[PDB]
Amino acid sequence: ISPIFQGGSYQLNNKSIDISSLLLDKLSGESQTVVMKFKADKPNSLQALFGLSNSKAGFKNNYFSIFMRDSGEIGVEIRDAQKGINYLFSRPASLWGKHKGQAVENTLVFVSDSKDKTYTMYVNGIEVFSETVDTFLPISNINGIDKATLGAVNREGKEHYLAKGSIDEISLFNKAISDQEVSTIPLSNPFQLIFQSGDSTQANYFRIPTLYTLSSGRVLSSIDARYGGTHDSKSKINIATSYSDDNGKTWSEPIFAMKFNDYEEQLVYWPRDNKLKNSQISGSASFIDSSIVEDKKSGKTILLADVMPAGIGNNNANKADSGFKEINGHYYLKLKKNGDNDFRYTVRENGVVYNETTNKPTNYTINDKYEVLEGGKSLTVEQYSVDFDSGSLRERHNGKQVPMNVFYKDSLFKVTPTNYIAMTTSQNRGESWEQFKLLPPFLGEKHNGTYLCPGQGLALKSSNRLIFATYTSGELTYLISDDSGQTWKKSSASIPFKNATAEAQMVELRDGVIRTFFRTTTGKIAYMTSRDSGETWSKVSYIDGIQQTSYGTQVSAIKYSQLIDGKEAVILSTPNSRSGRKGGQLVVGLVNKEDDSIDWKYHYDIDLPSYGYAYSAITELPNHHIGVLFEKYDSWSRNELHLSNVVQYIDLEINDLT
Numbered sequence: 035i036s037p038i039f040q041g042g043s044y045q046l047n048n049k050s051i052d053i054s055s056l057l058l059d060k061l062s063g064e065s066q067t068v069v070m071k072f073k074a075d076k077p078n079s080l081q082a083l084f085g086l087s088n089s090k091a092g093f094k095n096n097y098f099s100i101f102m103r104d105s106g107e108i109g110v111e112i113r114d115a116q117k118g119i120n121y122l123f124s125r126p127a128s129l130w131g132k133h134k135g136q137a138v139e140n141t142l143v144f145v146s147d148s149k150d151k152t153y154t155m156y157v158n159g160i161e162v163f164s165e166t167v168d169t170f171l172p173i174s175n176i177n178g179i180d181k182a183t184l185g186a187v188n189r190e191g192k193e194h195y196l197a198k199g200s201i202d203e204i205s206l207f208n209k210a211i212s213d214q215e216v217s218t219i220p221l222s223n224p225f226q227l228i229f230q231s232g233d234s235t236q237a238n239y240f241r242i243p244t245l246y247t248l249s250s251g252r253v254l255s256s257i258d259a260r261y262g263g264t265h266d267s268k269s270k271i272n273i274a275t276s277y278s279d280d281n282g283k284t285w286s287e288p289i290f291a292m293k294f295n296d297y298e299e300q301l302v303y304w305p306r307d308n309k310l311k312n313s314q315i316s317g318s319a320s321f322i323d324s325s326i327v328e329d330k331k332s333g334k335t336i337l338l339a340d341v342m343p344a345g346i347g348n349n350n351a352n353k354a355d356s357g358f359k360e361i362n363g364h365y366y367l368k369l370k371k372n373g374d375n376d377f378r379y380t381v382r383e384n385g386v387v388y389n390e391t392t393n394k395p396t397n398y399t400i401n402d403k404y405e406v407l408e409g410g411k412s413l414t415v416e417q418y419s420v421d422f423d424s425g426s427l428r429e430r431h432n433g434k435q436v437p438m439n440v441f442y443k444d445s446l447f448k449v450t451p452t453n454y455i456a457m458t459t460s461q462n463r464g465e466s467w468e469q470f471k472l473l474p475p476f477l478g479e480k481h482n483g484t485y486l487c488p489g490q491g492l493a494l495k496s497s498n499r500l501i502f503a504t505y506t507s508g509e510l511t512y513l514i515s516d517d518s519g520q521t522w523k524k525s526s527a528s529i530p531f532k533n534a535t536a537e538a539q540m541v542e543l544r545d546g547v548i549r550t551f552f553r554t555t556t557g558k559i560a561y562m563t564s565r566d567s568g569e570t571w572s573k574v575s576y577i578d579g580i581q582q583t584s585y586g587t588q589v590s591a592i593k594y595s596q597l598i599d600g601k602e603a604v605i606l607s608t609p610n611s612r613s614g615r616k617g618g619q620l621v622v623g624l625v626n627k628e629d630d631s632i633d634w635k636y637h638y639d640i641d642l643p644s645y646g647y648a649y650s651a652i653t654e655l656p657n658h659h660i661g662v663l664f665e666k667y668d669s670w671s672r673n674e675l676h677l678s679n680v681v682q683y684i685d686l687e688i689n690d691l692t
């Protein structure tokens with residue numbers, strides 16, 4: 035079906051455009067599709083792009099509108115006072131504003147389907163909502179519609195929700211076009227998706243992106259594949275990876291680097307209403323916060339992530355217990371058996387499960403995958419699936435058996451309910467990953483483990499040294515390996531905060547000189563410096579010229595390979611805002627070789643100051659472009675939970691930044 039109306043190049047300059055004559059008598063039947071290509075790089079706080087209204091006295095609540103907010107939220111209202119219907123459907127963080135300083139053409143498709151009683155909205159090729167109702171209201175079946183309007187809604191003869199922007203193309207159809215037909219509509223996106231809803235991970239949500247450029251030129255990305263909405267652990271989360279061999283143009287189907295099987299990998303539409311949005315998968319083990327590095331010596335890729343046993347997050351993790359027991363020099367994972375009230379077992383050498391009460395070995399062993407064997411025979415547990423069919427979250431057995439893992443709720447032997455760090459390696463640059471190993475405790479038997487800083491580890495250019503930053507109360511705890519990650523030692527660096535989420539990322543300014551940038555609770559990004567390849571660390575300083583919120587946001591950083599303005603250059607990625615996670619910037623700093631101080635000379639705004647930007651990953655692509663994979667939404671805001679396809683990838687050149 036071809037359009038019943040088609041128009042274009044409308045400038046919305048705080049003055050509505052009447053298209054009633056052109057459109058109203060074209061609308062027929064109960065199903066409609068609106069296709070609109072529009073720009074708004076300077077939107078008003080709340081504005082309507084398109085309206086169908088009853089403009090008469092006493093019918094101010096009889097209208098259909100497509101509206102947007104300066105937060106990037108998109109939505110519709112469908113209202114009829116006589117029918118007593120006031121529908122409002124929307125999703126935050128659905129829009130782009132600007133890319134490389136030019137207004138982005140957003141492609142909006144809204145489908146109003148009378149047969150399925152469903153309203154569906156897509157923006158930039160992403161389905162942002164699909165709502166089914168019991169009582170369907172066709173958009174031109176509103177009582178007394180007499181105006182079709184661009185850039186406002188006409189209510190009682192006056193202009194409401196006046197817009198600033200432009201509509202380059204608008205088409206309407208007297209049909210609810212299919213999901214297939216929608217897929218064929220040309221897009222003008224400034225971004226790409228690496229991970230996305232419906233891909234091989236089957237997670238509907240993603241958080242905590244990473245990027246790392248490998249020596250072969252392959253670019254590797256890791257991420258939290260988050261199943262139970264966007265909630266941190268406790269939840270179900272796996273670590274997924276994807277790579278690009280063509281400088282970020284295309285990406286491989288994801289595989290898992292770290293995954294648990296105690297709960298099904300389910301693509302679930304997590305509820306966003308206030309009563310249910312804090313529903314949380316409460317009995318699954320999870321991985322969270324990955325970080326990547328490449329080792330030149332072995333050629334291996336190394337990935338670490340936090341590990342959380344069933345039902346555990348940072349909120350309830352046993353502080354005061356590492357989960358290991360010291361036996362004269364060595365660290366052994368503790369285990370609690372079904373029915374015991376204490377942890378009377380340890381995993382000794384060769385995975386042998388050992389009874390600490392009688393110093394006796396058992397017939398149980400723990401394999402490489404942390405699965406429980408009895409006499410060489412693999413034990414199993416029944417898997418769980420989750421659903422909201424009952425009206426609340428239900429977690430229940432699904433009839434499938436999976437290998438029994440000591441991180442599981444249903445396991446015969448269970449680890450201490452605290453946080454761990456695991457490592458996995460790849461010998462094929464991310465085509466497959468090994469079974470993970472737990473790192474040993476670094477701060478003692480009675481200290482819970484540190485938290486990995488997501489993003490990149492650091493491979494010093496002039497040596498074999500590998501470093502992963504981690505954080506805990508009162509310090510950064512750098513984990514250092516000189517033997518391809520086979521053994522690790524810690525290097526502790528005091529910071530003047532208690533309990534900070536001090537997510538830290540490192541750059542090598544020059545041989546042996548490391549600057550670490552980190553999240554604080556002060557509203558400023560901090561930094562410290564090592565001049566001996568991470569053995570010792572300076573006191574903490576703060577960057578002026580960038581603002582973060584009181585709670586802070588992860589910051590990513592790289593040392594650029596090429597000189598800028600004749601100087602060594604560092605690039606920082608972070609929100610720049612004291613209010614929320616928004617106003618994303620890449621900030622280019624030039625190093626003063628007199629004292630290694632940095633002058634933050636260029637600020638590149640990734641999109642509008644009001645549009646969301648949270649955790650991020652940055653890398654120098656082999657062609658010297660800059661790749662950025664980032665949460666394009668406010669991942670703190672309690673209004674922006676459980677959004678799909680907001681972690682997005684862009685390609686930039688240094689001349690775009692400067």
Ligand SMILES: O=S(=O)(O)CCNCc1cccc(F)c1
Nearest residue numbers: 266267268322323340347348669
């Ligand atoms: O600042 S945010 O709230 O967006 C993310 C912080 N997540 C920290 C964390 C890290 C490891 C395990 C957890 F349960 C939680």
